[PDB]
């Protein structure tokens, strides 16, 4: 169905789109087209589903079971009205309460959904994308929404293609189609058309794809809504999975809980049939048990956690795409960091140089006045010539009246620094671009590690084209066969290579990036003037070049970085630098920001100290280490495993992007969760494979900021730290609540089982059970979410998902075998005191149901020889049920402040949460209000309480309080742990 | 699958876990029994902590109710044995050989006496004296009543009882022509019981009014009460009354209500057993 005009020639493209091959478009015209077609962002869907979506959430589980139970209650009440005459309210009330619970739950989940979606919507507009258009002959980095149809647009590697373009000029440009093809493989891009099909041809770039490598420039054939790709981004697109660790353990818990609640359910239904209860009562009992063992609250709780973390991330500017991933970030036991742009601020100005076996400097003040060595030397003229010609960046439009240091530049940090330094120290770079006409070009690739240009011979005595090339100083040193000395060539010596290395140490030691520079006055006889040049095929010799010299600029880390690394290494998170920059530079930066600490010598430092060859030094004797990319290339999986495992502080240097990838994968080969922080396009493969990816929103590329799970809109590295901290809290808070809810279960289930063992009068009722499970688990389980991380300071190092989850099998042992049991024996005690206080000694109480539950036998005798009627001893009964509710409410206090803190005693945590206190007080108020309102003895069978009955419960709750802090004090004193290994949440 | 040996099940000894649990649970049980025995402070063996819940006593019956109903035929001994064995079982404790001299029984008046209080609830005295009730009291209706027998010609006797609430003293109401018309009821020391059947608008008057007991008075004498508890007064015996319908129109069920009027006694709405005694009577052939 797609149509196109790609077949149309560049001059027919000229006439059709009235633009310019290189001069770009008129600003006036660009505003006219902007006013004509409107912003080039796809008109969004509806919303799509509005607030009616809340209905589904109101319908859905876990409340679904509450809904089935409620409708089963109303059904039961209808059946009870039909059969026999029944004054009792029974269910009815029950189904009402259940429905109300569901509705309230829905309000919660919808509220937290509202906050979370407001945040996630603000995050989309916090950072707008941008496009590099060409207008008035000059380049502009304008907003991505302001690109018009038919203006020229450049798209270096690492950028998203801002609209659908017809490539009129490109070099080595491999774009990634990704979504349009479904293929991860990059596809080359040239001005020539190859297929009638617009999707497969190479002259057509399209929206929502990104240029992996090389450079290109094209006229915008399609803007905004009506782009070739613009149909699938809304007509079929959506959220595409899949799994999230914390959420996965969440669902696993849900399946487990469902399983136990239904097993107990049917089991207690057969017990009901053996108890000879009526079906009308047996189903209500079933509903009771199920609604009991199943935490409604886990869901709303989770939503709470998510929303909270979202607010907190909103406050420190770090965007997270996937909320759950924040937890993943906490679980990180190894951060892999790129150096330039990441640990550093990717802002640079040239400080030092090296030519003619001499160290020169460039003044950085104002000034710049950077020579300071010899403005007249010829070797500086060649150096400056390379630095200017080989540089691809230029100043942005309307920037000429500003100081060179202070004007806006379109290019990477290195080339920008060069640009400013030549434009200031020597002369106008643009003028020397125009002087030395660039005939053919090689794009810059990280993979390639170098960049070079071939320009004409404007000089009268250069009787041929001139090649220039800058890059990794070592590749340059390799490729050369001679060096310029005072303007006169001279082959490479041992002396020259030694001075090169010594100067590289001297300048790299200051943590300065060391760009190497060389050139080649090509042999005349070898080629004529109109010789065809080949970028795809290497027709041009890269060897035997003429070395010129070195240039270095100071690279300052961001302020927060050393502190961040400090916190993470304080966090038991291994910090590992992975850069393709200089081995010496990355070592220095590492020492600086604390990836490598003093006193931890590398093998080479040891070889220096001990005056012995590096190979003689025991590699295990060594703490830290730096790995050269070349060594990495020849690494077996096993040897990387070794380096990674046996060395504490690790810095990878000279690494290819795939080597970043393999590094991360080696960290994943250890079983460890890894984070990846970066900026560059070449970070993307590394930050993809990661368990959690982080990228600069400013300094980052479009590809790597796409790929990442977390974007720092403020470029603040420290945001990672709080990030992981949040992720602990989530993993921490959730677990806490879980603990609490389970402790509610045992004392709800036990009475029906003790019921079987001896004919002991009913200690609680179904209505009493739901009373507990609703008053005692709605508010509190949610309130747990609001607690801050105790100490928490983890380090204690992040726990393996394999070691312990959100639902530890150990958690259930002190949740059921410890707390639950106590709440239970408390309940049974209070019940025995009630029944004792009414003439029925506890010893007398077993064997009673035989006549107790018997309706027509009113001759029941107690220990004091009193004859009780059915309705009297039943009143007594419901007055034993009522406190069991109240009493567990009393004991649930303890559990709340116990689950409030996992680590340090509840005194070190503080009271903090108002929702927790709110939970205590409104739990108690619900108890009271349930027991003393009129008609409650009839409605929910809740007969009012004798004052003493409230006090009965206390001892046990105190046993809880004491025990768990005897516990927490044992954690405190010893980490060896006996219970740490048995009763840790 | 649970791997073995190298794992040794889910872990090797693994003894101190079981030990920490039998220790902690024995501790928690020590706290449970501890709390159970301190609350066994306790309550005086002489009285329940709270009588308020026993309320005014409900009105009980001896021919053991099935569903508060009685349906049977004369012809089958088995038809009535269901009520016979229960009436004989209950009245086994009332045998004249069971009531004996040499304590704790002492004869009390054939004529119904004054409120007899054995003393304080304290245990300064031993096993306190208990007035005994001979089977001869309930009777009349030509020849004999009890123990039972069950002839159709009318009905077999329906014996009626009152709950034995600890230390309860029965109060007969004073008046001048109460809502009830209890016939052979003397004003003091009486506990009135009278039977009316099936609502008010449709009395149907299907049952004739005849009752009998101590002094031939159709109610309870205040000479037995108050009870001093199964502890202070084991082998005590409770006052006994008998309700007998001479006519009961064959082959029909008919609800009848035995109210026990008084200030001390109270009717409950939802408890049909409290302060009154409802029963469905139906004899058939």
């Amino acid at each position: 169905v797609s149509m196109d005009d790609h077949k149309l020639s560049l001059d027919e493209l000229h006439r059709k789109y009235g633009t310019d091959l290189s001069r770009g478009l008129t600003p006036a015209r660009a505003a006219e087209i902007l006013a004509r077609d409107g912003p080039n962002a796809l008109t969004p869907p509806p919303t799509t589903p509005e607030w009616v979506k809340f209905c589904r959430q109101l319908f859905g589980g876990f409340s679904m079971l509450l809904w089935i139970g409620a409708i089963l209650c109303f059904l039961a009440y209808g059946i009870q009205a039909a059969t026999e005459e029944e004054p009792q309210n029974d269910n009815l009330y029950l189904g009402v309460v259940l429905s109300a619970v569901v509705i309230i739950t829905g309000c919660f989940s919808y509220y937290q959904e509202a906050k979370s979606s407001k945040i996630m919507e603000s995050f989309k507009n916090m950072v707008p994308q941008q496009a590099l258009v060409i207008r008035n002959g000059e380049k502009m980095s304008i907003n991505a929404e302001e690109v018009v149809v038919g203006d020229l647009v450049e798209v270096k590697g690492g950028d998203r293609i801002p609209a659908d373009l017809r490539i009129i000029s490109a070099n080595g440009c491999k774009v990634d189609n990704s979504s349009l093809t479904g293929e991860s493989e990059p596809q080359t891009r040239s001005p020539d058309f190859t297929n009638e099909n617009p999707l497969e041809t190479r002259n057509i770039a399209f929206f929502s794809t990104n240029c992996v490598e090389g450079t290109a420039r094209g006229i915008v054939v399609y803007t905004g809504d009506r782009t070739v790709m613009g149909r699938i981004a809304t007509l079929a697109s959506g959220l595409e999975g899949g799994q999230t660790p914390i959420a996965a353990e969440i669902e696993h818990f849900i399946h487990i809980i469902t399983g136990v609640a239904v097993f107990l359910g049917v089991s207690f239904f057969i017990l009901s049939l053996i108890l000879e209860y009526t079906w009308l009562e047996a189903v209500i009992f079933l509903i009771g048990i199920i609604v009991a063992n199943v935490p409604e609250g886990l869901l709303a709780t989770v939503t709470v956690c998510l929303t909270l973390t979202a607010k907190r991330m909103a406050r420190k500017n770090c965007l997270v795409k996937n909320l759950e991933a924040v937890e993943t970030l906490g679980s990180t036991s190894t951060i892999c960091s790129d150096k330039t742009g990441t640990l550093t601020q990717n802002r640079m100005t040239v400080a030092h140089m090296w030519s003619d076996n001499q160290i020169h400097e460039a003044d950085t003040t104002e000034n710049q006045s950077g020579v300071s060595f010899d403005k007249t030397s010829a070797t500086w003229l060649a150096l400056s010539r390379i630095a200017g010609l080989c540089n691809r960046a230029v100043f942005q439009a309307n920037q000429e009246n500003l100081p060179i240091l202070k004007r806006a530049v379109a290019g990477d940090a290195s080339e920008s620094a060069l640009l400013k330094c030549i434009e200031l120290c020597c002369g106008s770079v643009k003028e020397m671009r125009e002087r030395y006409t660039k005939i053919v070009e090689i794009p810059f690739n990280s993979t390639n590690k170098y960049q070079l240009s071939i320009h004409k011979n404007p000089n009268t005595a250069e009787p041929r084209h001139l090649l220039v090339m800058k890059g990794a100083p070592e590749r340059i040193l390799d490729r050369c066969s001679s060096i310029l000395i005072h303007g006169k060539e001279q082959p490479l010596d041992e002396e020259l290579k030694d001075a090169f290395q010594n100067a590289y140490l001297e300048l790299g030691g200051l943590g300065e990036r060391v760009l190497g520079f060389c050139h080649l006055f090509l042999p005349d006889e070898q080629f004529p003037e109109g010789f065809q040049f080949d970028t795809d095929d290497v027709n041009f010799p890269l060897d035997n070049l003429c070395f010129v010299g070195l240039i270095s600029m100071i690279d300052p880390p961001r302020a927060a970085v050393p502190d961040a690394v400090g916190k993470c290494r304080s966090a038991g998170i291994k910090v590992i630098m992975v850069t393709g920059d200089h081995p010496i530079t990355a070592k220095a930066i590492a020492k600086g920001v604390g990836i490598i600490s003093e006193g931890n010598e590398t093998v080479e430092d040891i070889a220096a100290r001990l005056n012995i060859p590096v190979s003689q030094v025991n590699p295990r004797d060594a703490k830290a280490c730096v790995v050269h990319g070349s060594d990495l290339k020849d690494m077996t999986s096993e040897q990387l495993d070794d380096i990674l495992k046996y060395h504490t502080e690790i810095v990878f240097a000279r690494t290819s992007p795939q080597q970043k990838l393999i590094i991360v994968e080696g960290c994943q080969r250890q079983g460890a969760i890894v984070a990846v922080t970066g900026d560059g396009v070449n970070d993307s493969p590394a930050s993809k494979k990661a368990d959690i990816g982080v990228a600069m929103g400013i300094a980052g590329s479009d590809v790597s900021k796409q790929a990442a799970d977390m974007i720092l809109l403020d470029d603040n590295f420290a945001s990672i730290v709080t990030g992981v901290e949040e992720g602990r809290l989530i993993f921490d808070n959730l677990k806490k609540s879980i603990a609490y809810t389970l402790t509610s279960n045992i004392p709800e289930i036990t009475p029906f089982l003790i019921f079987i063992i001896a004919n002991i009068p009913l200690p609680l009722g179904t209505v009493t059970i739901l009373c507990i499970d609703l008053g005692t688990d709605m508010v509190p389980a949610i309130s747990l979410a609001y607690e801050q991380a105790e100490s928490d300071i983890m380090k204690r190092q992040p726990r393996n998902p394999k070691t312990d989850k959100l639902v530890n099998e150990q958690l259930i042992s002190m949740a059921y075998g410890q707390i639950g049991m106590i709440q239970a024996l408390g309940g049974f005690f209070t019940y025995f005191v009630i029944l004792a206080e009414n003439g029925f000694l506890p010893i007398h109480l077993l064997g009673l149901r035989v006549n107790w539950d018997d309706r027509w036998i009113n001759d029941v005798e107690d220990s004091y020889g009193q004859q009780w009627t059915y309705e009297q001893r039943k009143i007594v009964e419901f007055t034993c049920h009522t406190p069991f509710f109240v009493t567990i409410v009393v004991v649930q206090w303890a559990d709340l402040v116990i689950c409030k803190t996992r680590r340090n005693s509840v005194f070190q945590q503080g009271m903090k949460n108002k929702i927790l206190i709110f939970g205590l007080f409104e739990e108690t108020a619900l108890a009271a209000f349930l027991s003393y309102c009129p008609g409650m003895g009839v409605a929910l069978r809740m007969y009012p309480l004798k004052p003493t009955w409230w006090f009965c419960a206390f001892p046990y709750s105190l046993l809880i309080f004491v025990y768990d802090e005897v516990r927490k004090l044992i954690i405190r004193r010893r980490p060896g742990g006996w219970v740490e290994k048995e009763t840790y949440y | 699958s649970e791997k073995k040996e190298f794992l040794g099940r889910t872990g090797g000894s693994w003894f101190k876990i079981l030990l920490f649990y039998v220790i902690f649970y024995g501790c928690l049980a020590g706290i449970f029994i501890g709390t159970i025995q301190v609350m066994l402070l306790t309550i005086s063996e002489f009285k329940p902590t709270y009588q308020d819940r026993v309320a005014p006593p409900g009105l009980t019956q001896i021919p053991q109710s099935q569903k508060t109903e009685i349906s049977f035929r004369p012809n089958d001994p088995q038809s009535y044995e269901s009520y016979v064995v229960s009436i004989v079982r209950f009245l086994e404790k009332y045998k004249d050989l069971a009531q004996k001299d040499d304590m704790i029984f002492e004869d009390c008046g054939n004529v119904p006496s004054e409120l007899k209080e054995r003393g304080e609830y304290n245990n300064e005295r031993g096993e306190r004296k208990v007035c005994r009730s001979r089977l001869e009291w309930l009777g009349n209706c030509s020849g004999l009543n009890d123990e039972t027998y069950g002839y159709k010609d009318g009905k077999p006797c329906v014996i009626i009882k009152l709950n034995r609430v600890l230390g309860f003293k029965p109060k007969p109401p004073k008046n001048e022509s109460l809502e009830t018309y209890p016939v052979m009821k003397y004003n003091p020391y009486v506990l009135p019981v009278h039977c009316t059947g099936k609502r008010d608008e449709d009395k149907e008057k299907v049952g004739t009014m005849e009752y009998f007991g101590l002094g031939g008075y159709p109610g309870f004498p205040l000479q037995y009460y108050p009870y001093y508890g199964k502890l202070l007064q084991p082998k005590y015996l409770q006052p006994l009354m008998a309700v007998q319908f001479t006519n009961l129109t064959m082959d029909t069920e008919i609800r009848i209500e035995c109210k026990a009027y008084g200030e001390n006694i109270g009717y409950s709405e939802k408890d049909r057993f409290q302060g009154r005694f409802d029963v469905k009577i139906e004899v058939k052939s």
Partner: peptide
């Protein structure tokens, strides 16, 4: 036991507990 009295006490209590809840909640 008794009646009215503990019903009232419990009632005023529920009221105070609940007011406390709102008060702490609105802080």
């Amino acid at each position: 036991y008794d009646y009215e009295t503990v019903r009232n006490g419990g009632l005023i209590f529920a009221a105070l507990a609940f007011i406390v809840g709102l008060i702490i909640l609105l802080s």
